[PDB]
Write a protein that binds this DNA or RNA. Structure first.
Ligand SMILES: [Zn+2]
Ligand SMILES: [Zn+2]
Ligand SMILES: [Zn+2]
Ligand SMILES: [Zn+2]
Lengths: 70, 69
DNA sequence: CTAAGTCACAGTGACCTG
DNA sequence: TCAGGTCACTGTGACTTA
C-alpha cells in the first residue's frame, strides 16, 4: 500500500489486484488488451522507474509474477 | 549482402564510416547527448526486434563498430 | 552516393470518463 | 474507489532534400 509492486515507483492505487503506478497499470491494461514482446537479453531484466520502458517482456512477466490478473 | 554492423538488419548504405540500417544511422545521429541505461547487464543481443528495447547497448555497439560523430 | 531533415507512426503514463 | 479511455509527449525509421 505505497510503492509499485512492479517497478517500485510511487504507486497510485490498487490496479488489477496489486498496488501499482499509472505506468504499470496502463501497461498491463494494453498487454491484456492485445499486443509479441521481445526481451533484449536473458528474460531477467531489472524492472524499475528507468528500465520498465526498455523491456516489455520482463515487465509483463513481472506484472503477472506480482499478482496482476485480467 | 550488407548487414547493419550494429543490429544486423539489412544495411541501407555506408553511414558514419560503417554499414548501417536507417535505424541505427538515425539513432546514432540522435544520440550524439543522450545517456541511456541497460535493463539487463550491458550484453544485450541487439537485432531488428530488440534494438528499440535497449538503447544503452545499441549506442555501445555504435561506438564499438566504429561509428564516428 | 551519403548527410541531414522530415514526419507518420506507435508506446507511454498522467489524466479523464464511466 | 478502480477500470478503461485518452491523448500530448516522445523515439523510431523510412523516405526526402541537399
Ligand atoms: Zn510501476
Ligand atoms: Zn528482459
Ligand atoms: Zn541497425
Ligand atoms: Zn542492454
Amino acid at each position: 500500500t505505497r510503492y509499485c509492486a512492479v517497478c517500485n515507483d510511487y504507486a497510485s492505487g490498487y490496479h488489477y489486484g496489486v498496488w501499482s503506478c499509472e505506468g504499470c497499470k496502463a501497461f498491463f491494461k494494453r498487454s491484456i488488451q492485445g499486443h509479441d514482446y521481445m526481451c533484449p537479453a536473458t528474460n531477467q531484466c531489472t524492472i524499475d522507474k528507468n528500465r520498465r520502458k526498455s523491456c516489455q517482456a520482463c515487465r509483463l512477466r513481472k506484472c503477472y509474477e506480482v499478482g496482476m490478473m485480467k
